[PDB]
């Protein structure tokens, strides 16, 4: 639900909440798997920002991918691959 002028239903909202939750961070996460299993770190295999540049590119209020995203459950899965993007320049 994005507005409250149109028709919405609450029974039918919790199965937006959770169905969103199941898959939207996966698509996010497979962008971040390409960093360390396709080795494309920016738009060239050099420089490691675009994992460090993504740490508040995941954070947006224009797509609102922030508010559903777990502070330990999805954020810990996310930073461990950043930490493997960092060791391509360690």
């Amino acid at each position: 639900d994005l507005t409250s002028s149109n028709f919405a239903d609450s029974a039918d909202y919790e199965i937006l909440y959770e169905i969103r939750a199941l898959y939207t961070p996966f698509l996010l996460m497979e962008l971040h798997k390409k960093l360390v299993e396709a080795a494309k770190l920016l738009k060239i295999p050099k420089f490691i920002s675009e994992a460090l540049a993504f740490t508040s590119l995941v954070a947006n209020e224009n797509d609102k991918i922030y508010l559903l995203f777990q502070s330990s459950g999805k954020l810990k899965e996310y930073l461990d691959l950043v930490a493997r993007t960092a060791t391509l320049s360690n």
């Binding site: 639900d1 460090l52 740490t55 508040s56 995941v58 922030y66 508010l67 559903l68 995203f69 502070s71």
Partner: protein, 383 residues
């Protein structure tokens, strides 16, 4: 006792001589890699030039995170200042520093001086809930106008769709409460450029119109408000587009009042108005503004005396210690306001003879009683 100034030179030129052991040739730099129980400067500037997640397998740190008086001084000195983000000294998070600060905040060292992950990282739950401690440091102010707007629109839009459960709606509330004090100055800056303020021809004289005139001159241009000065210019304010706006402040910001100071503010404003109503006949001036006190239902949302004879006939309510600092925050003379307030009191009592000013409060509440229950009181000064 020149201790502090000696050991200034000492740690300065250990940190300098620990980036000078880095532009020298090396073999015995192992004797910094290994080599402490006290006196820092072995990991304070010996990896604090690059990422600290690429050096968690290095000798500098994660070997000094078990040595005491080394462990605790790295993560202390990095969380002193990172705050304000709309400045040339940090600028905004997006790169390198953001991912270090992540580490140091959910930690045995603590926030309320940094919140960089609590605006933008991913987290909503740990972020905006710990952010609640920080949005009482935006209680009636912004830091920058453009920075406050950034914290709050992120906290608003984050909290629009609650998905850390959906029941956790507290996180919307004080965030909205703080967006108003930046919105206010935007609106009012253009409005005094047009201008609409008007001034009384009775109290034009005195140092009592100077609380009013300052606020006007400040608000031509974008300026964060003070609230109590508005209650205190009341009776010196003219026009009927505004003559009833600090009745709002008694209610909703009467919460920021201490519930003892609020009484003597009320004693000041209704003692000014009773004299002002001696130059109005009909008592119509009082009648309209006591209507607005009854149609917002002021005395029944908080304690509030309605104008009546006792609240302006006693000189035991006059408190000089209060006046010397609520008008001692502007460059007017402290005696000048205090002797003016004094002579208001002795003019109430010189015309409580033949019931002159007495009947004029009696008949104001007493005629707005033909359609409401509010009627004159004086056994507590409240209905």
């Amino acid at each position: 006792n020149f201790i502090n100034i000696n050991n200034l030179y000492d740690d300065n030129h250990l940190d300098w001589n620990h980036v000078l052991c880095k532009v020298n040739l090396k073999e015995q730099c192992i004797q910094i890699a290994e080599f402490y129980k006290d006196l820092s400067g072995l990991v304070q500037t010996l990896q604090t030039l690059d990422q600290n997640d690429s050096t968690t397998v290095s000798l500098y740190e994660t070997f000094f995170n078990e040595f005491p008086k080394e462990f605790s001084f790295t993560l202390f000195e990095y969380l002193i200042k990172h705050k304000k983000l709309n400045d040339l000294i940090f600028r905004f998070p997006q790169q390198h520093d953001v991912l270090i600060q992540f580490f140091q905040e959910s930690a045995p060292k603590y926030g309320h001086v940094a919140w960089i992950q609590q605006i933008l990282d991913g987290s909503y739950a740990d972020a905006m809930n710990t952010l609640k401690n920080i949005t009482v440091d935006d209680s009636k102010k912004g830091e920058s106008l453009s920075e406050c707007e950034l914290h709050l629109n992120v906290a608003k839009l984050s909290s629009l769709l609650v998905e850390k459960d959906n029941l956790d709606i507290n996180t919307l509330r004080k965030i909205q409460y703080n967006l108003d004090t930046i919105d206010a100055e935007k609106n009012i800056s253009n409005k005094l450029k047009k201008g609409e303020v008007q001034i009384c021809k009775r109290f034009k004289n005195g140092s009592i119109r100077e609380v009013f005139n300052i606020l006007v001159e400040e608000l031509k241009s974008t300026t964060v408000v003070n609230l109590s000065d508005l209650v205190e210019l009341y009776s010196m304010l003219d026009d009927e587009e505004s003559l009833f706006i600090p009745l709002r402040l008694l209610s909703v910001d009467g919460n920021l009042l201490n519930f003892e100071v609020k009484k003597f503010l009320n004693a000041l404003v209704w003692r000014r108005i009773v004299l002002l109503n001696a130059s109005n006949e009909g008592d119509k001036l009082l009648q309209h503004i006591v209507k607005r006190v009854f149609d917002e239902e002021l005395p029944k949302n908080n304690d509030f005396p309605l104008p009546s004879v006792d609240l302006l006939c006693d000189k035991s309510l006059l408190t000089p210690e209060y006046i010397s600092e609520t008008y001692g925050r502007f460059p007017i003379d402290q005696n000048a306001i205090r002797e003016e307030i004094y002579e208001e009191i002795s003019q109430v009592e010189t015309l409580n003879s033949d019931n002159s000013l007495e009947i004029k409060l009696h008949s104001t509440i007493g005629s707005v009683a033909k359609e409401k229950n509010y009627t004159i009181n004086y056994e507590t000064n409240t209905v």
